[PDB]
Design a protein around this nucleic acid. Structure first.
Lengths: 78, 57
DNA sequence: CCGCAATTAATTAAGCC
DNA sequence: GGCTTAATTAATTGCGG
């Protein structure tokens, strides 16, 4: 179990377009609250979580992905 | 007052020496280095990230 | 579709000088 | 307080399921 993926230099350069958003502390603290009881979100319930925090789908999906990364990197960081 | 790693002059030595070989080491090299100098993988991953940013500009 | 690896551009802040 | 730089955040590309 290591399941390594593909190196970055070989990828086609990104297209960051664009705006650098930053979620409000309420937006954030709700996300964290949900995270505590549910590490994965099915699509319909992601839709609802977003629609009720006035974020996009992509945003919650990405937040969730980035949270899990942090979570594991913390878990197994002993 | 948030945590903030200060690297030994020895580990800073080994990080700069590795960065000199590749600017993008693979996970296993990173790991192997981590053992060799008593830091966790994540500390090294970030170092390389930051260090690369410096280089680019 | 989805997670995830593997990365970035931007930033926030610690702590030397 | 400036400055370098470790840490954090929201993003991306593309495999492998």
């Amino acid at each position: 179990a290591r399941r390594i993926g593909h190196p970055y230099q070989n990828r086609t350069p990104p297209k960051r377009k664009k705006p650098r958003t930053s979620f409000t502390r309420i937006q954030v603290a709700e996300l964290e609250k949900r995270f505590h009881k549910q590490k994965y979100l099915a699509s319909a319930e992601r839709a609802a979580l977003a629609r009720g925090l006035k974020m996009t789908d992509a945003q919650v999906k990405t937040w969730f992905q980035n949270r899990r990364t942090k979570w594991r990197r913390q878990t197994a960081e002993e | 007052r948030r945590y903030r790693t200060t690297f030994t002059s020895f580990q800073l030595e080994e990080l700069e020496k590795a960065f000199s070989r590749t600017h993008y080491p693979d996970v296993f090299t990173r790991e192997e280095l981590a053992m060799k100098i008593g830091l966790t993988e994540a500390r090294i991953q970030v170092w390389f990230q930051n260090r690369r940013a410096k280089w680019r500009k």
